Design a protein around this ligand. Structure first.
Ligand SMILES: CC(=O)N1CCc2c1ccc(Cl)c2C(F)(F)F
Ligand SMILES: *[C@@H]1O[C@H](CO)[C@@H](O)[C@H](O)[C@H]1NC(C)=O
Length: 359
């Protein structure tokens, strides 16, 4: 179990003004710290956020949070479930800002909701320093889905935060799971009327203005004022980052296909949709060609690293926990039989036999 701690700074809040927080399971004598960013889509206007508040309220409020959570996958403390960092200090940061961890806006007179995702991360790091993070040697900022994109948006700010607070020895690194999306065209066009089927570009363009979202500085300097939505897309923001970032992404990510208005029905796949799915797989594969630390299996799925069976998937015979361990060694010339760049080359969902079954 990880134990809940609500933030002492109650100005840093979830959407509805309730205090944000984090779940912590300490490991004394370990200088490794894993801070995981939960995912869970987003909402980019009052109408959609109101709907999210009656039926997905735990993603917008801490009022009903349990006082403990069980660590799973990379957050598990059992070596059997987590061969990678089973002995690390475990932190699970709940996603309650609906802003892809980008917001820096307080609830106010003029704002019905607070979007403080970027400030929640900064405040968690600040309050953890008094609980042992000051003695850390590696801080791995991880996250899945919207949390994976949040890693790309915030990993360098965490590094700059610790540097300015006087902790230059803490190595900040990023692990982005299932947050590497493409601003491609939809298979069938919709007008952006709701969340899940809104095209990627239009959803973020509306969200960043609604949340007062912040992006990494160097990426902001490239795309400049009004075009900061570009920095939510991994292949554009990754080359501007300086912290080492390991990228985990299914080649045929289900959330990517959802915003692309692709609904795989079990029905026969016609030529047009077959070419679309195969071309989507190529575009990931191409966008990851120059990403030295990456794990990209050819599967139709979504999220990996906190699933209890995340150890099962392999690319070229290497599991993700092994690839991450190889990444650790590389950050001490390639290593003999311990690879870090693992991108499937086969063109169709589940051509890798180790893909998740969905059972
Ligand atoms: C489920 C989720 O969290 N998704 C899916 C679409 C998406 C997410 C997160 C960040 C971004 Cl940036 C995008 C986008 F479509 F805009 F690419
Ligand atoms: C609480 O957080 C806000 C926003 O990050 C900051 O401006 C303020 O100084 C913090 N309060 C304390 C007491 O640290």
């Amino acid at each position: 179990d990880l134990r809940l701690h609500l933030l002492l700074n109650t100005s840093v809040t979830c959407n509805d003004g309730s205090p944000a927080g984090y779940y912590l399971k300490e490991s004394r004598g370990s200088r490794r710290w894993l801070l995981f960013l939960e995912g869970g889509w987003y909402c980019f206007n009052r109408e959609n956020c109101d709907s999210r508040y009656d039926t997905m309220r735990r993603l917008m409020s801490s009022r009903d949070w349990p006082r403990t959570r069980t660590g799973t996958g990379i957050l598990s403390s059992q070596p059997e479930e987590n061969p990678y960092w089973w002995n690390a200090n475990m932190v699970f940061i709940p996603y309650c800002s609906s802003d892809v961890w980008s917001g820096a806006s307080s609830k106010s007179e003029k704002n019905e909701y607070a979007f403080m995702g970027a400030l929640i991360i900064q405040e968690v790091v600040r309050e953890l320093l008094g609980r042992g993070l000051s003695g850390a040697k590696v801080l791995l900022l991880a996250g899945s889905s919207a949390g994976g994109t949040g890693v790309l948006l915030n990993v360098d700010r965490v590094a700059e935060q610790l540097e300015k607070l006087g902790y230059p020895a803490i190595q900040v690194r990023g692990l982005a799971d299932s947050g590497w999306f493409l601003d491609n065209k939809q298979y069938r066009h919709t007008d952006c009327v709701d969340t899940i089927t809104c095209a990627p570009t239009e959803a973020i363009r509306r969200g960043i203005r609604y949340w007062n979202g912040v992006v990494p500085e160097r990426c902001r300097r490239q795309f400049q004022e009004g075009e900061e939505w570009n920095c939510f897309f991994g292949y554009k923001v990754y080359p501007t980052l300086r912290s080492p970032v390991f990228v985990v992404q299914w080649l045929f990510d289900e959330a990517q296909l959802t915003v692309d208005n692709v609904h795989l029905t079990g029905q026969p796949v016609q030529e047009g949709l077959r070419l679309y799915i195969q071309n989507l797989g190529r575009e990931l594969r191409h966008t990851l060609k120059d990403v030295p630390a990456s794990f990209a299996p050819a599967c139709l799925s979504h999220e990996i690293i906190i699933r209890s069976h995340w150890t099962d998937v392999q690319v070229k015979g290497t599991s993700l926990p092994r690839a991450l361990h190889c990444w650790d060694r590389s950050l001490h010339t390639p290593l003999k039989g311990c690879p870090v760049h693992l991108v499937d080359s086969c063109p169709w969902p589940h051509c890798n036999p180790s893909c998740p079954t969905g059972t």
